[PDB]
Amino acid sequence: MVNTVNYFKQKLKTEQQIGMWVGLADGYCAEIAANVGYDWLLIDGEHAPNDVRSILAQLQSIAAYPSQAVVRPVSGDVPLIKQLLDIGAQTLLIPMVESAEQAELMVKATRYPPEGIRGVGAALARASRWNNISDYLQTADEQICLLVQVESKKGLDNLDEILNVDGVDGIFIGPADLSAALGYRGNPGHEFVQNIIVQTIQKIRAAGKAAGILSADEKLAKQYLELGTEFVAVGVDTSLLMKSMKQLLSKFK
Amino acid sequence: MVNTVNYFKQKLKTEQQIGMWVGLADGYCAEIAANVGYDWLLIDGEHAPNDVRSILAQLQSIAAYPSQAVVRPVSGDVPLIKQLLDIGAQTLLIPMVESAEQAELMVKATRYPPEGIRGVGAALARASRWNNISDYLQTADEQICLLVQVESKKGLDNLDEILNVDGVDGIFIGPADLSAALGYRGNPGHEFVQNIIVQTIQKIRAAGKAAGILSADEKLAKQYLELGTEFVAVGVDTSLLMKSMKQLLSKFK
Amino acid sequence: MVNTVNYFKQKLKTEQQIGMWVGLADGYCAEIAANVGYDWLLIDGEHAPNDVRSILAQLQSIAAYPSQAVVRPVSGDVPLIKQLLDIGAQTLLIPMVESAEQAELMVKATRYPPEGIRGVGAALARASRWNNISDYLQTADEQICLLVQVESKKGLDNLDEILNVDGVDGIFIGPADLSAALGYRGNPGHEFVQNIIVQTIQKIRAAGKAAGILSADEKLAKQYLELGTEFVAVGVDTSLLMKSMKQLLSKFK
Amino acid sequence: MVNTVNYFKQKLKTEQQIGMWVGLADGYCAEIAANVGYDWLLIDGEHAPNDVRSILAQLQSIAAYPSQAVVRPVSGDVPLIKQLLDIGAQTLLIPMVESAEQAELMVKATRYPPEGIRGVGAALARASRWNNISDYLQTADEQICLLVQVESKKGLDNLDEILNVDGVDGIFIGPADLSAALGYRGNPGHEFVQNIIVQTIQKIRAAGKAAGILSADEKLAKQYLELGTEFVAVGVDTSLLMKSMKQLLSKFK
Amino acid sequence: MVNTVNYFKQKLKTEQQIGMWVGLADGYCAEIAANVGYDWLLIDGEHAPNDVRSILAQLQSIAAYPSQAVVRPVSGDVPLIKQLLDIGAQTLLIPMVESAEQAELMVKATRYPPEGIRGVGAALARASRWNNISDYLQTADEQICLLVQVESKKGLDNLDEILNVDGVDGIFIGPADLSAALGYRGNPGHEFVQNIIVQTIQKIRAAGKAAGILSADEKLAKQYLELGTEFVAVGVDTSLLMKSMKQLLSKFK
Amino acid sequence: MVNTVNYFKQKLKTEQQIGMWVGLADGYCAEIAANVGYDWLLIDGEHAPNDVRSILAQLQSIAAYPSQAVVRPVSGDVPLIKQLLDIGAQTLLIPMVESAEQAELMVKATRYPPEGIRGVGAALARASRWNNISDYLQTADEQICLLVQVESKKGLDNLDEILNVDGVDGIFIGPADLSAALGYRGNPGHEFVQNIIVQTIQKIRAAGKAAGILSADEKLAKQYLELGTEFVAVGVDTSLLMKSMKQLLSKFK
Ligand SMILES: [Ca+2]
Ligand SMILES: [Ca+2]
Ligand SMILES: [Co+2]
Ligand SMILES: [Co+2]
Ligand SMILES: [Co+2]
Ligand SMILES: [Co+2]
Ligand SMILES: [Co+2]
Ligand SMILES: [Co+2]
């Protein structure tokens, strides 16, 4: 078997990828999302009740479908990153990255020694298909994609330094965390926050990195796509389930 | 503690109850549905991948919310009915009921001896809260609600006989199974099928039983409500999740 | 490896075995019960929310301890009996047995062809330790113990016929089901029910079969032990957990 | 989306398919087996500790790989067959089929009304991908494959009658059950049993049905393949795991 | 919907709340405890085999009952605190707190930016009921309760400094960890330890914070209640289950 | 009950113990491995998808068998070490230990106060069998075994200092991590790596510590055993499952 090609990583340079957030924390729900045709699915290990074992079930569900899986760990924890790579997550989204030093550690966390610090256990890993990918330890690094989130004042204070880190493939803006950090908690739509988001996207792309964001607001998501943003998540499974059920009940009250 | 009052059962005689089908087969998804404000939630043990233990998890999730739980077992199996009653399901929907003899057996299956055949194990049952409901064995039968499905030609051939069974609280029409049985599989909206459904609702209510149905078609659901139908399910969680995600992607293709 | 000796089965002829009912439906809770020193533990697949997979977890927990496991299936279902034997349950308690014909079918359900109808799949079974017990198919039948419950008027109407069935090792009286069947639901302590229970124990033992019963009432359990009853369950984990927590709170209200 | 093509079913007429028995009862273990390249994988719901939910996890794991899934239910139970078809199993292996009447019921159990009795719930089914396969109710029946086991004296007594059932795609011989039924329990390799197995394969193929069998004995498996047997399982995951670990330890004792 | 009111937090100033430790690590066992009538239940993520997903199941079980849930994480880990708040734990008990600097970080860990560092993901959170609590991001902080444990010499060495931290609602004394730290492991009942515990309760209350403790010793628990201690846990589910089963067996040996 | 004797720990001084790596992450698979007769089984929480709860299930499965369990946590995390000790793991293997300061912290992490920092919660712990081991807090420390991995250049740079740490019972060499660290990723069999491994084994034993290693290469494993290596793992369950299934298929292609 040849290593699974990371099409998400390649497409950061060739197209704009439409994403769906997956926080229903279940292999069955992840498969429903996988049937829709999103370019990427974000399995959320930060804000949904997921662990390594439930994330594995969802990677297994999604794997039969063309949608590319991206996993968000609860934090930039090196041993947790090791665990998510070995169950076969090829793209990671690291929340709350705030310095070039932290970004560089996340780069090393995703790469094998001697250049990085990813723990080596290919005999046990779904990532290598238990060494059925015979050259995995030589071909693994090439298909791993590292995305970091800028979503705090400290992240914005270190943006230019993070953008000079080789191995950071993309910077994703978190509007909820960022609007809260800016003293506009629950009000990311305010011009003060949106002007910072637009300037941040423009700086990310000017440094030759992919820019990403999540917005469930169709107008904002379309504006971000018009600006060239490479990976845009346009909704959240929990939100869509709740709103679809509420909108239906409202027709009958 | 006093036995949990079956408000669904009482409301069969006082109002029209709006329902949501729950087939995501998970305590977390069932809780999301429980927050919307449906009069009843149908935990589907027939057409969703559920078992006694996953149904228990969903009963526990939903129990904090006013929505009334209704459980559909995979068939009219007396021992499975016993298991679902003991985990605390107070309303059952029995699929593919086809004779007064089968309906009478379902009545007995839901009632304690000596009048019925429900196995007695109150020390172990969530239904009795492990005997924290001190008079459960005296008060249980009063709060159990039995619904049977008519959804085959043989069911229609025995409709008047089923409607004379004391202990059948409601008859629910299954349009998918019924349209297939009539040789209109996938086409319940045909006049041939709909004229039979309307006639059947009228006969159910004329016999003093509650009538029920599911339709994700807003026009048909509203027509059934205009006809007086007492318990109408107006959508399905799996369907709403898939459609909401597809409609969103179509805005960005 | 030699087949696991069924000490419960041997001890039916040599001592009085004290039992604990296990309805907490969990490997962790079953292990806590296994540490106490009961002669037998009843994993309840009838009145607790158990399935083949949760019963397996509990057999695995209990297996490190001297307590003998007895499993109760939800009914006398031949294919379910096959499944419980292959995960390694060596003693079964069949609820609501009502005829010698049904008892004879339960005997055959527990024995390999050609004499019985137990499905053969030793390569897959924990019972054979996946054929690490090399002579399992020759030694299995000898260590299987069949217990049947008499707990209805029909069971009492067929008691002498059930007691003449070769392969029925023990008859267990269910006081909850039996008192309900007799029109004394929730009142097994009444003399009318107790006189029938005592006569039934005396007839079971006179026919050379082991007699069994459950009572959480210490006086009744001691009376049953004085009468020679071979397997007496003296309490229920769910009941003891609830009562211990209530009694403690009552000291502080 | 078009309905998943059942390549196993097509290949019954064009090649000899090599199978692996999957009884480790786990999505992770099923994926390991799926990477090897077997033509078919048998998810065993009869002799491994599986239920609808664990079988679903395994179908989801295997679905990313070319290996075709076949599911064996615990018995020819119509409602369980409905549940396994809805989670998306397209090929079923029914144990212990013993009459043309039972084989005909299994045919109807796998087909929609009005010609069959498969319950209709496409909105909830992974089989229809929750109606994302838009024409599922018209295209489903064509891709369902029914295999029945002949593995008892009564099955052999009804072989010619079972072989005349339209809709039975294959007859699979169970050597463990059959050798036990014949009074050679644990000794299927005896000439008395093997002559019956060879004669039975010849009759199945002479009637234009596919013949199948399991043997972990390489010589017997190769003999069955030389006889033209269409679907041959050549080993069992639990057996291979145990033997590989024992053989390794024996090098070091 | 309005944010769930934290009655435990309010009652720290108005009454003495009686608690039960929940370490059976299971939604079913947590529900049994929830039925008893304790003022609070401690879901132990430090000393029972719990994770975010098993804690969620227990929050869902308990939520239908008046008992207030308190969750203990395995350590004062900021990302784990984020995960437990989002699944809807409103009161946290942080073990082994040893400085005002660590206590201040735990305060920030429980509050949204810009004043704290709690990660913002309300669309995904049971805490916000997936934004069905429409003003959650404005109302959340008010209903969060932070308890810290003093249970080491370093904790006692920083007691006055911890008691001056605004946002620490209560200090809980851990007698097991504290007696071990003092060189009296397994002997918290010694006067040397008890004089320190009483002095510590007095200092906690003198500083205007709530004092808490666990003791399964009825005399010590009543003494702590006489001293004004605001939140007293009086037993442990695992302990009560084991002791109740052992006491029963001892009546029959 | 007396504390479970750690025979693995004792045998470090009296014999050479043969090990199997257990990464199938499942109680059922761990039991299969436990039946084979390995001296020790390594439950891998670093490179297999395990968490505290799945490791508990595996300890419960294995506990009925003489094979000694060793658990590898994902990293030398003090709170995770506490959790693994409380579920009853008596031998820990800490990956990537790189200093005497880190080794000394791991020693303290495994011992109760006042000499160590292991959190005290014996009422809740399987380790104490919920205090059914009445003297657990006095007898626990004696039966705990600490193994640390040297598998990086920094570990080799601190080998003599790690070997002087009292409480380190064994040093285990990780050939995958070490060969990668040395710039021979995937090529541990190179003489440059093997000469370092042999020298490292000789130094470990010269300091009076137990030496350990994993190799699935029979020749290398036998060489390490001839050198006196005290604990040698000779294979991996995931590898043996994959290779056994591939080797079988290759006989039939
Ligand atoms: Ca199950
Ligand atoms: Ca978990
Ligand atoms: Co964020
Ligand atoms: Co239907
Ligand atoms: Co009974
Ligand atoms: Co068979
Ligand atoms: Co403590
Ligand atoms: Co390593």
PDB file of N, CA and C in Angstrom, chain F residues 194-248:
ATOM      1  N   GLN F 194      23.013  -1.124  16.608  1.00  0.00           N
ATOM      2  CA  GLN F 194      23.094  -2.366  17.418  1.00  0.00           C
ATOM      3  C   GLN F 194      24.283  -2.298  18.375  1.00  0.00           C
ATOM      4  N   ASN F 195      25.422  -1.732  17.950  1.00  0.00           N
ATOM      5  CA  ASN F 195      26.601  -1.652  18.854  1.00  0.00           C
ATOM      6  C   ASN F 195      26.205  -0.778  20.053  1.00  0.00           C
ATOM      7  N   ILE F 196      25.473   0.302  19.820  1.00  0.00           N
ATOM      8  CA  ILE F 196      25.010   1.210  20.917  1.00  0.00           C
ATOM      9  C   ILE F 196      24.039   0.443  21.834  1.00  0.00           C
ATOM     10  N   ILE F 197      23.107  -0.305  21.264  1.00  0.00           N
ATOM     11  CA  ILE F 197      22.109  -1.105  22.039  1.00  0.00           C
ATOM     12  C   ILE F 197      22.839  -2.114  22.927  1.00  0.00           C
ATOM     13  N   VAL F 198      23.802  -2.858  22.377  1.00  0.00           N
ATOM     14  CA  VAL F 198      24.546  -3.898  23.156  1.00  0.00           C
ATOM     15  C   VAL F 198      25.317  -3.227  24.301  1.00  0.00           C
ATOM     16  N   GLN F 199      26.041  -2.142  24.024  1.00  0.00           N
ATOM     17  CA  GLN F 199      26.831  -1.365  25.026  1.00  0.00           C
ATOM     18  C   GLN F 199      25.878  -0.884  26.138  1.00  0.00           C
ATOM     19  N   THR F 200      24.699  -0.365  25.761  1.00  0.00           N
ATOM     20  CA  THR F 200      23.665   0.147  26.691  1.00  0.00           C
ATOM     21  C   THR F 200      23.128  -0.986  27.569  1.00  0.00           C
ATOM     22  N   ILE F 201      22.811  -2.144  27.010  1.00  0.00           N
ATOM     23  CA  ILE F 201      22.384  -3.330  27.810  1.00  0.00           C
ATOM     24  C   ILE F 201      23.505  -3.636  28.823  1.00  0.00           C
ATOM     25  N   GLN F 202      24.761  -3.719  28.369  1.00  0.00           N
ATOM     26  CA  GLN F 202      25.896  -4.085  29.261  1.00  0.00           C
ATOM     27  C   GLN F 202      26.007  -3.087  30.418  1.00  0.00           C
ATOM     28  N   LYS F 203      25.861  -1.792  30.151  1.00  0.00           N
ATOM     29  CA  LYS F 203      25.981  -0.750  31.202  1.00  0.00           C
ATOM     30  C   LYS F 203      24.815  -0.859  32.180  1.00  0.00           C
ATOM     31  N   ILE F 204      23.591  -1.083  31.672  1.00  0.00           N
ATOM     32  CA  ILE F 204      22.393  -1.200  32.548  1.00  0.00           C
ATOM     33  C   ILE F 204      22.646  -2.343  33.543  1.00  0.00           C
ATOM     34  N   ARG F 205      23.031  -3.506  33.056  1.00  0.00           N
ATOM     35  CA  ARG F 205      23.220  -4.684  33.928  1.00  0.00           C
ATOM     36  C   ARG F 205      24.422  -4.462  34.862  1.00  0.00           C
ATOM     37  N   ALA F 206      25.486  -3.791  34.413  1.00  0.00           N
ATOM     38  CA  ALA F 206      26.690  -3.509  35.245  1.00  0.00           C
ATOM     39  C   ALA F 206      26.307  -2.605  36.427  1.00  0.00           C
ATOM     40  N   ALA F 207      25.306  -1.749  36.267  1.00  0.00           N
ATOM     41  CA  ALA F 207      24.816  -0.870  37.352  1.00  0.00           C
ATOM     42  C   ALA F 207      23.818  -1.610  38.264  1.00  0.00           C
ATOM     43  N   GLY F 208      23.544  -2.893  38.006  1.00  0.00           N
ATOM     44  CA  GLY F 208      22.645  -3.715  38.846  1.00  0.00           C
ATOM     45  C   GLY F 208      21.171  -3.434  38.580  1.00  0.00           C
ATOM     46  N   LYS F 209      20.831  -2.800  37.460  1.00  0.00           N
ATOM     47  CA  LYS F 209      19.414  -2.610  37.051  1.00  0.00           C
ATOM     48  C   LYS F 209      19.037  -3.706  36.055  1.00  0.00           C
ATOM     49  N   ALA F 210      17.742  -3.973  35.917  1.00  0.00           N
ATOM     50  CA  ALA F 210      17.230  -4.872  34.865  1.00  0.00           C
ATOM     51  C   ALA F 210      17.267  -4.143  33.511  1.00  0.00           C
ATOM     52  N   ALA F 211      17.671  -4.829  32.464  1.00  0.00           N
ATOM     53  CA  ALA F 211      17.648  -4.297  31.092  1.00  0.00           C
ATOM     54  C   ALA F 211      16.461  -4.923  30.367  1.00  0.00           C
ATOM     55  N   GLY F 212      15.844  -4.161  29.487  1.00  0.00           N
ATOM     56  CA  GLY F 212      14.729  -4.632  28.657  1.00  0.00           C
ATOM     57  C   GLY F 212      14.796  -4.104  27.256  1.00  0.00           C
ATOM     58  N   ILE F 213      14.034  -4.717  26.365  1.00  0.00           N
ATOM     59  CA  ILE F 213      14.001  -4.330  24.936  1.00  0.00           C
ATOM     60  C   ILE F 213      12.844  -5.064  24.287  1.00  0.00           C
ATOM     61  N   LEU F 214      12.400  -4.531  23.167  1.00  0.00           N
ATOM     62  CA  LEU F 214      11.466  -5.178  22.224  1.00  0.00           C
ATOM     63  C   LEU F 214      12.211  -5.426  20.915  1.00  0.00           C
ATOM     64  N   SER F 215      12.076  -6.622  20.368  1.00  0.00           N
ATOM     65  CA  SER F 215      12.456  -6.905  18.964  1.00  0.00           C
ATOM     66  C   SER F 215      11.587  -8.033  18.446  1.00  0.00           C
ATOM     67  N   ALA F 216      10.943  -7.795  17.324  1.00  0.00           N
ATOM     68  CA  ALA F 216      10.169  -8.820  16.595  1.00  0.00           C
ATOM     69  C   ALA F 216      11.119  -9.647  15.726  1.00  0.00           C
ATOM     70  N   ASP F 217      12.410  -9.327  15.719  1.00  0.00           N
ATOM     71  CA  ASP F 217      13.421 -10.104  14.945  1.00  0.00           C
ATOM     72  C   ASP F 217      13.913 -11.227  15.858  1.00  0.00           C
ATOM     73  N   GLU F 218      13.652 -12.479  15.503  1.00  0.00           N
ATOM     74  CA  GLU F 218      13.950 -13.619  16.407  1.00  0.00           C
ATOM     75  C   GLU F 218      15.454 -13.654  16.691  1.00  0.00           C
ATOM     76  N   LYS F 219      16.281 -13.449  15.676  1.00  0.00           N
ATOM     77  CA  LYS F 219      17.752 -13.504  15.873  1.00  0.00           C
ATOM     78  C   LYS F 219      18.176 -12.428  16.885  1.00  0.00           C
ATOM     79  N   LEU F 220      17.685 -11.197  16.728  1.00  0.00           N
ATOM     80  CA  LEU F 220      18.124 -10.097  17.625  1.00  0.00           C
ATOM     81  C   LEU F 220      17.625 -10.415  19.044  1.00  0.00           C
ATOM     82  N   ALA F 221      16.356 -10.811  19.173  1.00  0.00           N
ATOM     83  CA  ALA F 221      15.758 -11.137  20.494  1.00  0.00           C
ATOM     84  C   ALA F 221      16.594 -12.226  21.181  1.00  0.00           C
ATOM     85  N   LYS F 222      16.922 -13.293  20.460  1.00  0.00           N
ATOM     86  CA  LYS F 222      17.784 -14.352  21.035  1.00  0.00           C
ATOM     87  C   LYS F 222      19.170 -13.808  21.416  1.00  0.00           C
ATOM     88  N   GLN F 223      19.771 -12.909  20.629  1.00  0.00           N
ATOM     89  CA  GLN F 223      21.077 -12.280  20.989  1.00  0.00           C
ATOM     90  C   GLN F 223      20.909 -11.505  22.294  1.00  0.00           C
ATOM     91  N   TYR F 224      19.829 -10.732  22.433  1.00  0.00           N
ATOM     92  CA  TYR F 224      19.620  -9.915  23.652  1.00  0.00           C
ATOM     93  C   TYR F 224      19.467 -10.849  24.855  1.00  0.00           C
ATOM     94  N   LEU F 225      18.743 -11.952  24.693  1.00  0.00           N
ATOM     95  CA  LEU F 225      18.577 -12.940  25.784  1.00  0.00           C
ATOM     96  C   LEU F 225      19.952 -13.544  26.122  1.00  0.00           C
ATOM     97  N   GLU F 226      20.792 -13.866  25.141  1.00  0.00           N
ATOM     98  CA  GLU F 226      22.150 -14.433  25.429  1.00  0.00           C
ATOM     99  C   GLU F 226      22.979 -13.415  26.219  1.00  0.00           C
ATOM    100  N   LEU F 227      22.771 -12.120  25.990  1.00  0.00           N
ATOM    101  CA  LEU F 227      23.497 -11.054  26.728  1.00  0.00           C
ATOM    102  C   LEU F 227      22.971 -10.924  28.160  1.00  0.00           C
ATOM    103  N   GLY F 228      21.892 -11.608  28.551  1.00  0.00           N
ATOM    104  CA  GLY F 228      21.402 -11.573  29.949  1.00  0.00           C
ATOM    105  C   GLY F 228      20.230 -10.612  30.147  1.00  0.00           C
ATOM    106  N   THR F 229      19.730 -10.018  29.069  1.00  0.00           N
ATOM    107  CA  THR F 229      18.639  -9.008  29.130  1.00  0.00           C
ATOM    108  C   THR F 229      17.461  -9.627  29.911  1.00  0.00           C
ATOM    109  N   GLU F 230      16.968  -8.934  30.929  1.00  0.00           N
ATOM    110  CA  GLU F 230      16.043  -9.500  31.929  1.00  0.00           C
ATOM    111  C   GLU F 230      14.604  -9.519  31.402  1.00  0.00           C
ATOM    112  N   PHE F 231      14.173  -8.521  30.617  1.00  0.00           N
ATOM    113  CA  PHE F 231      12.764  -8.487  30.114  1.00  0.00           C
ATOM    114  C   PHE F 231      12.778  -8.143  28.629  1.00  0.00           C
ATOM    115  N   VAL F 232      12.456  -9.146  27.821  1.00  0.00           N
ATOM    116  CA  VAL F 232      12.530  -9.066  26.349  1.00  0.00           C
ATOM    117  C   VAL F 232      11.136  -9.314  25.781  1.00  0.00           C
ATOM    118  N   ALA F 233      10.596  -8.320  25.082  1.00  0.00           N
ATOM    119  CA  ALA F 233       9.337  -8.472  24.326  1.00  0.00           C
ATOM    120  C   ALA F 233       9.718  -8.947  22.923  1.00  0.00           C
ATOM    121  N   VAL F 234       9.030  -9.959  22.426  1.00  0.00           N
ATOM    122  CA  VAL F 234       9.478 -10.715  21.234  1.00  0.00           C
ATOM    123  C   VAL F 234       8.503 -10.525  20.085  1.00  0.00           C
ATOM    124  N   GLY F 235       7.420  -9.794  20.326  1.00  0.00           N
ATOM    125  CA  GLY F 235       6.448  -9.520  19.259  1.00  0.00           C
ATOM    126  C   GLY F 235       5.327  -8.598  19.701  1.00  0.00           C
ATOM    127  N   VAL F 236       4.447  -8.307  18.762  1.00  0.00           N
ATOM    128  CA  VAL F 236       3.390  -7.273  18.871  1.00  0.00           C
ATOM    129  C   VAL F 236       2.122  -7.894  18.295  1.00  0.00           C
ATOM    130  N   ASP F 237       1.020  -7.818  19.031  1.00  0.00           N
ATOM    131  CA  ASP F 237      -0.252  -8.456  18.624  1.00  0.00           C
ATOM    132  C   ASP F 237      -0.704  -7.907  17.267  1.00  0.00           C
ATOM    133  N   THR F 238      -0.748  -6.583  17.050  1.00  0.00           N
ATOM    134  CA  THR F 238      -1.186  -6.019  15.750  1.00  0.00           C
ATOM    135  C   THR F 238      -0.338  -6.591  14.605  1.00  0.00           C
ATOM    136  N   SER F 239       0.980  -6.665  14.777  1.00  0.00           N
ATOM    137  CA  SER F 239       1.916  -7.195  13.744  1.00  0.00           C
ATOM    138  C   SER F 239       1.628  -8.675  13.466  1.00  0.00           C
ATOM    139  N   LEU F 240       1.444  -9.470  14.514  1.00  0.00           N
ATOM    140  CA  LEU F 240       1.224 -10.931  14.362  1.00  0.00           C
ATOM    141  C   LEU F 240      -0.113 -11.188  13.682  1.00  0.00           C
ATOM    142  N   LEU F 241      -1.141 -10.416  14.037  1.00  0.00           N
ATOM    143  CA  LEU F 241      -2.473 -10.527  13.391  1.00  0.00           C
ATOM    144  C   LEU F 241      -2.358 -10.218  11.896  1.00  0.00           C
ATOM    145  N   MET F 242      -1.771  -9.075  11.539  1.00  0.00           N
ATOM    146  CA  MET F 242      -1.601  -8.665  10.130  1.00  0.00           C
ATOM    147  C   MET F 242      -0.759  -9.728   9.396  1.00  0.00           C
ATOM    148  N   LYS F 243       0.397 -10.128   9.923  1.00  0.00           N
ATOM    149  CA  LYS F 243       1.321 -11.017   9.167  1.00  0.00           C
ATOM    150  C   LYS F 243       0.652 -12.396   8.993  1.00  0.00           C
ATOM    151  N   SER F 244      -0.012 -12.922  10.026  1.00  0.00           N
ATOM    152  CA  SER F 244      -0.645 -14.261   9.963  1.00  0.00           C
ATOM    153  C   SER F 244      -1.720 -14.242   8.866  1.00  0.00           C
ATOM    154  N   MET F 245      -2.482 -13.151   8.759  1.00  0.00           N
ATOM    155  CA  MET F 245      -3.587 -13.066   7.793  1.00  0.00           C
ATOM    156  C   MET F 245      -2.986 -12.911   6.390  1.00  0.00           C
ATOM    157  N   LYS F 246      -1.876 -12.187   6.269  1.00  0.00           N
ATOM    158  CA  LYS F 246      -1.268 -11.951   4.939  1.00  0.00           C
ATOM    159  C   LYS F 246      -0.629 -13.254   4.439  1.00  0.00           C
ATOM    160  N   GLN F 247       0.098 -13.934   5.309  1.00  0.00           N
ATOM    161  CA  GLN F 247       0.776 -15.219   4.982  1.00  0.00           C
ATOM    162  C   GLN F 247      -0.254 -16.265   4.528  1.00  0.00           C
ATOM    163  N   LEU F 248      -1.396 -16.343   5.195  1.00  0.00           N
ATOM    164  CA  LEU F 248      -2.480 -17.279   4.807  1.00  0.00           C
ATOM    165  C   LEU F 248      -3.014 -16.901   3.422  1.00  0.00           C
TER     166      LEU F 248
END
